[PDB]
Enzyme design. Structure first.
Site, PDB file in Angstrom:
ATOM      1  N   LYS B 187       0.697  -1.186   0.179  1.00  0.00           N
ATOM      2  CA  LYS B 187       0.044  -0.123   0.009  1.00  0.00           C
ATOM      3  C   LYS B 187       0.951   1.330  -0.162  1.00  0.00           C
ATOM      4  O   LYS B 187       0.376   2.366  -0.404  1.00  0.00           O
ATOM      5  CB  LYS B 187      -0.847  -0.111   1.329  1.00  0.00           C
ATOM      6  N   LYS B 188       1.923   1.249   0.634  1.00  0.00           N
ATOM      7  CA  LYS B 188       2.925   2.323   0.447  1.00  0.00           C
ATOM      8  C   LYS B 188       3.739   2.440  -0.851  1.00  0.00           C
ATOM      9  O   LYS B 188       4.600   3.331  -1.141  1.00  0.00           O
ATOM     10  CB  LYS B 188       3.946   2.232   1.646  1.00  0.00           C
ATOM     11  N   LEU B 189       3.459   1.635  -1.813  1.00  0.00           N
ATOM     12  CA  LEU B 189       3.859   1.830  -3.304  1.00  0.00           C
ATOM     13  C   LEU B 189       2.964   2.638  -3.855  1.00  0.00           C
ATOM     14  O   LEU B 189       2.392   2.377  -5.124  1.00  0.00           O
ATOM     15  CB  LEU B 189       4.032   0.446  -3.978  1.00  0.00           C
TER      16      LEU B 189
END
Ligand SMILES: CCCCCCCCCCCCCCCCCC(=O)O[C@H](COC(=O)CCCCCCCCCCCCCCC)COP(=O)(O)OCC[N+](C)(C)C
Ligand SMILES: CCCCCCCCCCCCCCCCCC(=O)O[C@H](COC(=O)CCCCCCCCCCCCCCC)COP(=O)(O)OCC[N+](C)(C)C
Ligand SMILES: *[C@@H]1O[C@H](CO)[C@@H](O[C@@H]2O[C@H](CO)[C@@H](O)[C@H](O)[C@H]2NC(C)=O)[C@H](O)[C@H]1NC(C)=O
Ligand SMILES: *[C@@H]1O[C@H](CO)[C@@H](O[C@@H]2O[C@H](CO)[C@@H](O)[C@H](O)[C@H]2NC(C)=O)[C@H](O)[C@H]1NC(C)=O
Ligand SMILES: *[C@@H]1O[C@H](CO)[C@@H](O[C@@H]2O[C@H](CO)[C@@H](O)[C@H](O)[C@H]2NC(C)=O)[C@H](O)[C@H]1NC(C)=O
Ligand SMILES: *[C@@H]1O[C@H](CO)[C@@H](O)[C@H](O)[C@H]1NC(C)=O
Lengths: 35, 665
Positions: B187-189
């Site tokens: 999700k932090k991509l």
């Protein structure tokens, strides 16, 4: 809650620009400190 | 003796058939690690109940007679009176203690699981990832046999003393932790995280002081804070499993979680993750520190598989519940997208029209509410609109029509509306499985401007301020510049707008680059008259503050000239309170003198606070925590006495409430 905390006057409700002397990074996942 | 069996811990032939898989997932294992994790989790939940769940603040949240607007998942859920809420929290605390000590483990797990989820579903404004994690961990530990080692039930029962447990008890927990790490990483991509926008100001903390010895501040905030977090999430997911890289993974995880505990105020999340980190070791690690399948066997394997699949699927299930979709995806709490989006709200206007007279009025932004998360979700806005529509008749208002105008920017973008300001939310249409038709799309095409805007933010003086606005075609903005905000100017950056002054009813059409000087103390309007969205900016200064600061600087200069020996002439009578510092036996001082004295006192207080040793701060922290715990205990005892033996007279109740609020000292 009276008629002064529920209602606002026409001039005070449309003041878009509020300067300082009156962070802004609310991260949701942070418990609110309150004792 | 195969390499795969040594690395992964199982052979390929174990996955050939269902019976062999069930046999593999029900092999005996040592229960020591699960027992240690149970003890740590129970202790942390016991410490967390009176602090973050709101046991101390419960008497000012569910107060009887107060008309508040709740935000539950289902409208049918309603809070009980205060005394029964205190009873529910008492039951939850008892369940947490029973889980910690391992006394009647299943009953304690149920008594912690049910009230916790009732509280969690009672309010959508207090959802976060670390509470969803606690709920899931309690749900998982309800079925696991965690009481076979180092527990009271072992001392009081021989049959559950040092017994074996199936492997899926460890598999479920390992899979949950791995899912947390990997989903957080993936999700932090995002485009706002790999570029350094989200959490950009975290490199100024002193904990990152050594990194500044070899790197600049921007490179520290890009290489270490942003990319390091994603790499650490994925590597912590993968390294803890294998035996070769477990020590390095443990070291990195411990450092990361200690830094996250110190930097943020998330609570017990870092400590729970640290406690769950040693679960990847051998299931007999705590011991060396001291010194045809049936039905349940298949049910355990089925539960493990289905639970892991559901945990994988749920964060990406936002295409089914499209009602909760917004600029971001879904309600916050179960997507593992931690610290990815930042919001800064500029203005919220709530207008109401009476349905009998036709009068138009304005309500307070956050009235009848206890949280501020209703500005970003359509469901919470609809619930707030219904609450206002049923509460306003108490204030001589007939059937109202309520319109909202909310400005919000995500990750330092243009300030734009989120909801349509021409739609009555009371009569609007909203369903959980269909997309809302009154949510404005995010102007994502205006992504690169976040560079250019920053340049203007560097071009300003020490007192000027700027606000960037992006508006849709057809809509208009009505604004009232206050009397203090003199020297206010509006500049157009892209598109076509028309600025109207209502004092003389005069409007001018502005093109790109044109600048106008708006009046102070009057109303003006900005209309958008272009087929595409228009971006402009407000540049303003506060004249009253500037004049007051100049006068205070002159007064301080005069005081310094008096102090250093100059200005041999007699002092003005207004300067006498400056030297004396106390208004006794004289006329009341001017507001300028009072402001100067207040500023001096505030500066002295700030300096005194800065010159404070560490041990005093630690002692004050411990005293504050003790006060919180004591208030929680006393209020719970008062509520339980009211429930059991009845309620006393008002004098005794007031005395007990006064005693419960007393500082420890
Ligand atoms: C016809 C139907 C056929 C079957 C259809 C369905 C097939 C499903 C297959 C997937 C499920 C397999 C479950 C196996 C569980 C298992 O083996 O349990 C465990 C496996 O551990 C887990 O439960 C891990 C959970 C996920 C953690 C992240 C795994 C990352 C894997 C990366 C690629 C390899 C055995 O470990 P152990 O305690 O014996 O320790 C040995 C390993 N060392 C020594 C290194 C610590
Ligand atoms: C095997 C081991 C494997 C590794 C395990 C690693 C994890 C173990 C965790 C075990 C639990 C550790 C304790 C946790 C304490 C804790 O969380 O601290 C606190 C919470 O804990 C507490 O404060 C508990 C206090 C309990 C009350 C103690 C009272 C003591 C009174 C003593 C008598 C005083 C007498 C004075 C007059 C003489 C976190 O607070 P916060 O999140 O609000 O912090 C705010 C500050 N920032 C934002 C900077 C973070
Ligand atoms: C009001 O307008 C702006 C702030 O809104 C300021 O004007 C600046 O004027 C100084 C005077 O030399 C220049 O050095 C700055 O470069 C100007 N800023 C710009 C053009 O962005 C000032 O606070 C006020 N100016 C006037 C004329 O009242
Ligand atoms: C200034 O220009 C605006 C630009 O449209 C005028 O606004 C429109 O306002 C009239 C009200 O008189 C509406 O009937 C139109 O529908 C509005 N236009 C749009 C596109 O919505 C405004 O009237 C002008 N002011 C004066 C005093 O003439
Ligand atoms: C602009 O700056 C002035 C600086 O004084 C702000 O004013 C003070 O306003 C607050 C209102 O929140 C009063 O409580 C203080 O007494 C004021 N200070 C005085 C009179 O010295 C003002 O709020 C700022 N913003 C606007 C929109 O004017
Ligand atoms: C009007 O409202 C006020 C306060 O909201 C209160 O006096 C009463 O509810 C109403 N009074 C009359 C005369 O309608």
């Amino acid at each position: 809650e009276t008629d002064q905390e529920v209602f606002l006057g026409p001039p005070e409700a449309q003041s878009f620009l509020s300067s300082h002397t009156r962070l802004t990074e609310r991260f949701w996942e942070s418990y609110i400190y309150n004792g | 003796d195969s390499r795969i069996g040594k690395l992964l811990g199982f052979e390929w032939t174990d996955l050939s058939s269902w019976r062999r898989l069930v046999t593999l997932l029900n092999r005996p294992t040592d229960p020591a690690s699960l027992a240690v994790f149970r003890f740590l989790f129970g202790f942390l939940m016991v410490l967390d109940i009176p602090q973050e769940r709101g046991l101390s603040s419960l008497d000012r949240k569910y107060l009887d007679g107060l008309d508040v607007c709740r935000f539950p998942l289902l409208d049918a859920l309603r809070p009980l009176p205060l005394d029964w809420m205190y009873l529910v929290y008492t039951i939850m605390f008892l369940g947490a203690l029973g889980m910690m000590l391992g006394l009647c483990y299943r009953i304690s797990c149920v008594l912690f699981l049910l009230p916790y989820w009732y509280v969690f579903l009672l309010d959508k404004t207090s959802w976060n990832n670390h509470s969803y994690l606690y709920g899931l961990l309690a749900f998982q530990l309800t079925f696991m046999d965690a009481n076979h080692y180092w527990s009271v039930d072992g001392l009081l029962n021989a049959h559950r003393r040092n017994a074996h447990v199936p492997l899926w008890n460890y598999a479920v927990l390992r899979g949950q932790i791995f899912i947390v790490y990997f989903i957080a990483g993936v999700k932090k991509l995002d485009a706002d995280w790999v570029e350094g926008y989200s959490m950009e100001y975290l490199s100024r903390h002193w904990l990152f002081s050594p990194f500044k010895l070899l790197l600049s501040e921007e490179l520290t905030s890009l290489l270490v804070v942003h990319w390091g977090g994603l790499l650490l999430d994925l590597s912590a997911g993968f390294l803890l499993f294998f035996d070769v890289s477990r020590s390095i993974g443990l070291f990195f995880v411990s450092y990361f979680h200690c830094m996250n505990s110190q930097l943020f105020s998330i609570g017990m999340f870092s400590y729970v993750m640290l406690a769950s980190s040693p679960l990847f070791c051998s299931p007999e690690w705590p011991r060396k520190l001291v010194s045809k399948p049936g039905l349940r066997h298949q049910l355990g394997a089925a539960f493990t598989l289905l639970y892991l699949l559901e945990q994988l699927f749920l964060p990406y299930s936002h295409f089914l519940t499209q009602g909760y979709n917004n600029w971001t995806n879904g309600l916050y709490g179960y997507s593992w997208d931690m610290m990815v989006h930042s919001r800064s709200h500029q203005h919220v206007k709530i207008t109401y029209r009476d349905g009998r007279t036709g009068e138009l009025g304005y309500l307070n932004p956050g009235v009848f509410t206890q949280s501020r998360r209703w500005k970003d979700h359509a469901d919470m806005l609809k619930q707030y609109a219904t609450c206002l529509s049923r509460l306003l008749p108490k204030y001589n208002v007939t059937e109202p029509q309520i319109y909202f105008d909310i400005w919000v920017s995500i990750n330092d973008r243009f300030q734009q509306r989120i909801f349509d300001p021409r739609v009555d939310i009371v009569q609007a249409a909203w369903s959980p499985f269909q997309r809302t038709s009154w949510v404005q799309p995010l102007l994502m095409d205006l992504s690169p401007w976040r560079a250019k805007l920053q340049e203007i933010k560097s071009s300003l003086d020490n007192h000027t301020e700027v606000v960037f606005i992006a508006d849709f075609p057809g809509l208009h903005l009505e604004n009232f510049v206050s009397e203090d905000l003199g020297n206010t100017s509006i500049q157009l950056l892209q598109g076509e707008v028309t600025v109207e002054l209502v004092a003389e009813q005069k409007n001018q059409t502005l093109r790109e680059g044109e600048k106008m000087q708006l009046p102070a103390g009057e109303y003006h309007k900005v209309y958008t008259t272009s087929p595409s969205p228009s971006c402009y900016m407000y540049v303003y200064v506060n004249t009253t503050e500037l004049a007051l600061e100049q006068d205070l600087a002159y007064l301080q200069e005069l005081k310094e000239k008096v102090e250093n020996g100059s200005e041999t002439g007699p002092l003005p009578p207004e300067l006498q309170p400056l030297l004396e510092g106390e208004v006794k036996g004289g006329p009341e001082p001017t507001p300028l003198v009072q402001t100067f004295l207040r500023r001096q006192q505030r500066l002295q207080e700030i300096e005194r606070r800065r010159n404070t040793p560490f041990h005093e701060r630690f002692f004050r922290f411990l005293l504050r925590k003790l006060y919180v715990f004591r208030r929680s205990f006393l209020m719970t005892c008062i509520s339980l006495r009211n429930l059991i033996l009845g309620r006393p007279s008002l004098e005794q109740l007031a005395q007990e409430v006064t005693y419960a609020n007393l500082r420890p000292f």
